RNA sequence: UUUUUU
């Protein structure tokens, strides 16, 4: 916005373009919204998509490609697929030269070797980052029933610092075994 | 010409089995038009599936015929005539969403098939297409969404 | 719209809550470790579950967040929860095909 | 209202013009028909080889006047070329959904290495437009054996 | 491939009959929004449409029968509304009281509409004739004739120097301000007429007959670019669009579509009626839609721009 | 602003060209920018039939070049877009194009000039030739080609020459040629040489041929070069290539119109069954005028042949996809395009016909007339009169359809029964009569005879002589089958005489045989009108509910049995208004009259309700004014409700409202009555009521002056009846006697002897009885309502 | 027996 440029972010599922589109009219300006039934304002510099719709006006020219910078790529771990995997593919080929590309993921083990095609597919180098240690932390417990009235006892199989517990699996697997359809 | 000799009411019935993604069954309460056209369109899959499968491509005919699922036929022809979605609810075993999903996903194809008759050259099938899509979107079916407005 | 408020308590989602929006919650549940897809009544894999529990710690209105397993029918047969709750979560492959 | 007898002798013995005898029908009327497929020849002109662009001080650059030059990239069409230089599109258009139109160069790909170094103003051929007519479509296997015209 | 048209808001039920016609005027330089409604009673209720709903402001009434035709101003704090009571009276939509009185019977005017200036207040009577009053000037300087039957719509062009009148039995005539002068009478329908609208700067009118077609005039000469068919019922009301690309018709089989120009077809339908919908207008910069009908209840749409 | 323009976007362009103009005004590019916005609106309205608007704006764009050629003359694109401006309105229907020219355009600069067609062709080439000269490119070379063809075709169009434009075609080839010479590597020079060369001045095909194939090569994606090869075969016998060509021309672009347009000419002549769908096509995706004239074709075609209204051919087709209305469209257009062509006149005129615009349809036969004064067949000239002429009778102007059937030979039967129907409508019986039995002479197809003969009993019954007409529709009875027209017509002649035994006949003879009649209300009209005749007077109303009872649809039936309850027998008030009810809900065209019946049964009923708002008798009636401001019944019943609201409102105590409307609902009535076209005893009824009641309500509101003005300027009118000076009397003696006083035998017998004069009324009996009544004379009260009462019972 | 898009 600040370039006077156009921007596509485009996201996989047909309910999740919807919240997304609600969050960033609020948060700044402009921003259409297209899909199978839905056609909020084609004209904005924010158009948010559902990729079977960037890949139907690519094969077209349709006169938005000349004006993007920003592809924004949301859920790039549906290439996985097995129906609409193609899909993604035939998008981050046809992509002229002139448009940047967002790769948004899901901290998958070969990520370079995936943005090493797509560097060397364009002719430009792709910058890869990577994070661990998600704030806030979980703890993963097993509930098992016992004494239903009030109590209720919760065993730890796995805790903030990643070790695995096997005392929280036996502990519980012994409270089953003492213990031992819809009315339960 | 298997589309173009029906009702509007009719034809998205038929168009109805490329849709549904529900289990299946054919049916006994249906006119004879409708149970007919269903054997037309059986038909024309199975030429085409056995044009496939001629040629060095594997799939077999069976499989190629079997993503036609109707069951939908009879829901979407008694919706097609202004009856409330209650009565529907009613009269068969599928879940309320998955209706209303294929219903959104009917009059969203019965648009791009008035896009495709007019290229081809075929003025009836447009203005049945024009029709068979207006009366098929009127109600909780295409509530605007919340998020959306 | 009312979860985001917090003006409901409890929810019984299913996986379309765990893909199609985001809307954080506090404590998150399971009830069951397999799930089928195409007639074959398969286990979560690693790359499910990481999502369902990840939404479950809020941001800054807690310590941490607690995801609670919920196994009633036999016992857990921790052999498969060490690949299930941890594991390197999935290639990427490619599914390239030819259509008409 | 009126009471009924009048009410009928008017609707019955007021004219005879609500007899079958008169009405629009009745007459079987025909009509020639007169066909003109001269007139379906279409001739299309040639675009404006210039633009009367502007002029740049070279130093801090303010229009001093504006001077004809000539186009470049003229008779390039949506429908024919794919490149960011083409006319922009029909009008106002189906987002997408479109055959017979061009997607631009994918990003991989170049495709353009030619000279055709001619360049000329006066480059008359001294094409022969009677000697040795082609006379064969392409894609057909006969054309038409039109009379020589002296 | 068309857009997100929907409902915003929905009276339950304004008044206690049918509710004849509906004016939305944009009138002051800030953001009013005021929708006068009026009524088989004598109300001629003013509404204001603030923010997301309509607050009932003005309960305004001097009529004695139910209201044919009200109007509103674009410069001036003002309406106007003619009845069954042979009175025209004029109010002053700022302290809620009647300003004039004019008596007119039904051989004197039938329905308003004011100049684009707001001075002149022409209706159409019985005889055939259009009438001119003057606002705040007194009554009657002048009438133009057309030698024809009872006249039901009266239209101006936003520009002035136009001014057309359809009557019952169809003829279409159309006057210029300027003079005075007849330029051409249209034929058009076989059916009574009772709608007809301009369009912004004022070269396309727009009729709607009893029979249920739409012609589309062009005006400066005589030729017609087209008849919209796609009611089942007579047509009440049409009205143009603030840009000249799309209007809105009110049919009597309980349905408000929505065209445009450029291609002649219909883009969206409105089945939320449960009675004839007898009047439909657009706001200031049109993105939203007044429908007023037979069961009381005022509709409020959503048409983005 | 330049911007906007080329995005198309031209209102836009155009106000901003505008705001910099009033800033400076010799701005070289901001003039240029309007005149090629002007030139592309003028395009756009060219595509759709608009003759009008283009010339307009071309006149506009012109304005603006020769303002910007004024400063820069140096400078060839302005001369070349002038030339363009100049040379786009070919085919515009010459007598449409005068345009104001001024400058230095025509040289030397000389006020304004007003240019024709030729002229302005010809400024444009001189436009072409000046742009040329200083800048010499091949583009300007074969736009001037090309407008030499326009000046050479116009010339041959208007038939004013032939072989004296050799040399402008000649011209038109060499510049062409050395277009295609400086640059033979593009489609447009080859393809613009190809057309001019198979001009029919010029018919040299080879070269045609050679050059759409060098078009096509030079560029595959080639539409307009195909589609140029199929028209080239197609004219010459080769419908199966021609076939080819079209089809890869239409492969390549799917929403090219002319090789649309060639496929439907080619099912057409191999006689294919899509041919009428090929047209329409053509006609949805744009104006072209040869697919017009082929819809509009197979449009009349379709509706002669009167076998077809069960087919779904002429069912879904013709009356769901709107035929009629958009060949009627498209008719408009061509005819305004072409306008010299008789048979698109006639087809406009009978399609108009079938819409009911009879004017429209006078007028396109009245223009067909004028093109076929002169022509080798002479039967067309006369259906032409004919058909206009009938038109013409049909809506007035009698005299005029009179004169139409004149000039033609009286010898067919159409001519002849035309003739006596214009004679009929003017007066004139006895032509009318003659004109009958000549048509009589020559007749085939029995049914015709029955109808002339039908014809001669109604027009022979309107100059008197029943005798004569009775006997002449038993001879059409005689006939070997009966058709269902003498018969009501001989219950309708019948019922004209107060006579009951030939009626009952007829309707029997009607009932009996006749079942293909689909009309099931005429019959139910003449059966009840035959029971009234009699006198029975509630046989009538059990008549009506016996065929309502048969046919529980049918609106009409319904709203009859309203009217009739109204009228016979009103004790049966509530059920009217149920019935009335029932025949508005059963529809909604039939509002008009149901509403008016259950309104004044509502009257008649009284306040029998719940005290209920929104259904009583004023709003019904105000509902029926609403839909149908145009009868007097309405009017009237609108006065008889507002004085009953206020009794009623009396009654209960609270408000008298609703107060003074009677002379403004008057004057509505005598209007209305004054457009009405005969049912002389039925308006005369309604307006001495009118009358009668305004002159009552103004007396009980209280404004005593405008009743008695009203009653002297009536009597100031005509002579005395004496029923208008009973209500002078009533105004006159109002304000006496509202104060106590003693009234003298003089006036008293005044009074007594004017109410002897208009006797047969007991409502003047009841109010002179009241009078006795308030003087005190008891006994001479008791009399006089003695006497209302005897005359109400007899 | 989960999930989905032109």
Known sequence: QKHMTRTIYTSPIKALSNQKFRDFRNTFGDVGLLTGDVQLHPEASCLIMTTEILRSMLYSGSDVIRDLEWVIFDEVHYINDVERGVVWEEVLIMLPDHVSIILLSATVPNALEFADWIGRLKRRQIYVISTVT?????????????????????????????????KGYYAAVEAKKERMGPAQ | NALSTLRPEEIAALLSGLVCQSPGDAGDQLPNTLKQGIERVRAVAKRIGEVQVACGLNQTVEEFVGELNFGLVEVVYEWARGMPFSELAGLSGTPEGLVVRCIQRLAEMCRSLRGAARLVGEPVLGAKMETAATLLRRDIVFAASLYTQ | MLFSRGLVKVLFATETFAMGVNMPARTVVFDSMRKHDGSTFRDLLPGEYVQMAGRAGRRGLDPTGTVILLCKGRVPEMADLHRMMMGKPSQLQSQFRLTY | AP?????????????????????????????????????????????????????????????????????????????????????????????????????FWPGGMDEPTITDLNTREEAEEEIDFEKDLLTIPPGFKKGMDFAPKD | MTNQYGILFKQEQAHDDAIWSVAWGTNKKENSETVVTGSLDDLVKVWKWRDERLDLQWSLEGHQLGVVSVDISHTLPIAASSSLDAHIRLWDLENGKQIKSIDAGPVDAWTLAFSPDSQYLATGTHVGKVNIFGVESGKKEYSLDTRGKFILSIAYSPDGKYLASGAIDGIINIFDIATGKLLHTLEGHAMPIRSLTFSPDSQLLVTASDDGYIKIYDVQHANLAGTLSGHASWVLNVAFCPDDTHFVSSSSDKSVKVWDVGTRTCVHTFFDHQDQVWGVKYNGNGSKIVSVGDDQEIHIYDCPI | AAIQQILGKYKEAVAQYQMIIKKKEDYVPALKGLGECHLMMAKAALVDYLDGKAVDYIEKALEYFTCALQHRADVSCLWKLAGDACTC???????????????VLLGQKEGKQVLKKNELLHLGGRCYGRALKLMSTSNTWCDLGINYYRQAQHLAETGSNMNDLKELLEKSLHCLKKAVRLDSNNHLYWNALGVVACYSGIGNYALAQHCFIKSIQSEQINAVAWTNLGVLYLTNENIEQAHEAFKMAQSLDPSYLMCWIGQALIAEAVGSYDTMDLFRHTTELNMHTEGALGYAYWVCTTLQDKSNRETELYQYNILQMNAIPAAQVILNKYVERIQNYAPAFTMLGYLNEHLQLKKEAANAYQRAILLLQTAEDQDTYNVAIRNYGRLLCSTGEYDKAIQAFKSTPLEVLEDIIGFALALFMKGLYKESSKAYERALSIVESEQDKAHILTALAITEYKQGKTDVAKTLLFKCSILKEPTTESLQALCALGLAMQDATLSKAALNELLKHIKHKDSNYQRCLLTSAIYALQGRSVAVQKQISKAVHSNPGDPALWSLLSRVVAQYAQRNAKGGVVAGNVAHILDSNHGKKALLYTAVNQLAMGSSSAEDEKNTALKTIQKAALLSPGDPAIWAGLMAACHADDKLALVNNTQPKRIDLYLALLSAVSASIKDEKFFENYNQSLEKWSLSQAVTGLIDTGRISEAETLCTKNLKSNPD??????????????????????????????????????????????????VYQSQGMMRAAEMCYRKSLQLASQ
């Open chain 1, 134 to 166: 998600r704030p806030v932390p979980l703890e993963h417990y097993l509930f098992t029933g016992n004494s239903s009235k009030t109590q209720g006892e919760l065993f730890l199989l796995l805790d903030s610092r990643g070790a695995f517990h096997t």
């Open chain 4, 3 to 103: 009471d009924l007898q009048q009410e009928a002798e008017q609707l019955f013995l007021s004219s005879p013009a609500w007899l079958p005898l008169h009405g629009v029908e009745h007459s079987a009327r025909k009509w020639q028909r007169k066909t003109d497929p001269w007139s379906l020849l279409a001739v299309l002109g040639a675009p404006v080889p210039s633009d009367l662009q502007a002029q740049r001080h070279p130093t801090t650059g303010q229009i001093l006047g504006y001077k004809e030059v000539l186009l470049e990239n003229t008779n390039l069409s949506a429908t024919t070329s794919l490149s960011l230089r083409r006319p922009p599109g029909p009008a106002s258009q189906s987002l997408w959904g479109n055959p017979t139109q061009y997607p």
């Open chain 6, 89 to 103: 309105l070919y085919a515009v229907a010459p007598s449409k194009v005068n345009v104001h020219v001024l400058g």
């Open chain 6, 721 to 770: 009846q004496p029923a208008v000076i009973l209500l002078l009397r009533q105004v006159q003696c109002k304000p006496l006697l509202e104060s106590q006083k003693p009234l003298p035998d003089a006036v008293l017998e005044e009074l007594q002897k004017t109410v002897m004069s208009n006797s047969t009324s007991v409502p003047a009996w009841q109010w002179l009885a009241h």
